[PDB]
C-alpha cells in the first residue's frame, strides 16, 4: 500500500473511532480499534520492523 494512503486510512479509522466513542456503540469502538491495530501492523511491516 502506498504509504501516504495507509496513513490517511489510519486517520480515517481514528475519525470513526472518535465518533463511535462520542456516541454509545461500544461494540463498534472495538471493531474499529481492531481494524486500527491491523492498519498499524501493516504500516510497521512496510517499514521493515516486522515480517
Amino acid at each position: 500500500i502506498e504509504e501516504e494512503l495507509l496513513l490517511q486510512q489510519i486517520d480515517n479509522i481514528k475519525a470513526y473511532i472518535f465518533d463511535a466513542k462520542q456516541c454509545g456503540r461500544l461494540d463498534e469502538v472495538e471493531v474499529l480499534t481492531e481494524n486500527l491495530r491491523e492498519l498499524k501492523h501493516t504500516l510497521a511491516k512496510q517499514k521493515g520492523g516486522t515480517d
Binding site: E2, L5, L6, Q9, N12, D27, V31, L32, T42
Partner: protein
C-alpha cells in the same frame, strides 16, 4: 452477544459500480446521484432480524479507485461474506469482478460466502451483461446472485437476507 450475531461483510468491485450506494440504500434508505468516489474504506452498521434471529452487519465499503487496490485485503480478510458488485451496463466491470473472485480465492477460505450484485439494473435499455450469463457464472462459483438497484430500491434487502441465511455462524 449471545443473542446478537456480528456479521463482517466487505463490498468489492470497480470504481463507479455502486458499492457505496448499495450500502447507503440498505442502511439509510437513501440514494444520491452525486455521491463521490470512496477514499480508502468506509464503515456502516445495521442491526436486523432475519430468519428469526438478530444480526448486526458490520459493512466495510472499499474504494474501487486503482490506487486503493492494495488496501482492500485489510477489509476483505476475516469477512464472513464478500459482496462483489458490477454494473450491468458495463461488461468490463464483470471482467473486473472475475479478477476480484481470483483475489479472494488466493487469500480467503473457499467457504467464504460470496454474493454477486449486478447493480444499476434500473438501466434496462443499456444493458451489456445478460442476466442469464451472470447468474450462470455465479452458480459456477457457488455465489449468491442478484440484480440490484440502489436508485430504485430493488433487491438490496434480498441480498443481505440471503447472505445471512448462508453464513453458518
Amino acid at each position: 452477544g449471545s443473542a446478537l450475531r456480528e456479521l463482517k461483510v466487505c463490498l468489492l468491485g470497480d470504481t463507479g459500480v455502486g458499492k457505496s450506494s448499495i450500502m447507503w440504500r440498505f442502511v439509510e434508505d437513501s440514494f444520491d446521484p452525486n455521491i463521490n468516489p470512496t477514499i480508502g474504506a468506509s464503515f456502516m452498521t445495521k442491526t436486523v432480524q432475519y430468519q428469526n434471529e438478530l444480526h448486526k452487519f458490520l459493512i466495510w465499503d472499499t474504494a474501487g479507485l486503482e490506487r486503493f487496490r492494495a488496501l482492500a485485503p485489510m477489509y476483505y480478510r476475516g469477512s464472513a461474506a464478500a459482496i462483489i458488485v458490477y454494473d450491468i451496463t458495463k461488461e468490463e466491470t464483470f471482467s473486473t469482478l472475475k479478477n476480484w473472485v481470483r483475489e479472494l480465492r488466493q487469500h480467503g477460505p473457499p467457504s467464504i460466502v460470496v454474493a454477486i450484485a449486478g447493480n444499476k439494473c434500473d438501466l434496462t435499455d443499456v444493458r451489456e451483461v445478460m442476466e442469464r450469463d451472470a447468474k450462470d457464472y455465479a452458480d459456477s462459483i457457488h455465489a449468491i446472485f442478484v440484480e440490484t438497484s440502489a436508485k430504485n430500491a430493488i433487491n438490496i434487502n434480498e441480498l443481505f437476507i440471503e447472505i445471512s441465511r448462508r453464513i453458518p455462524s
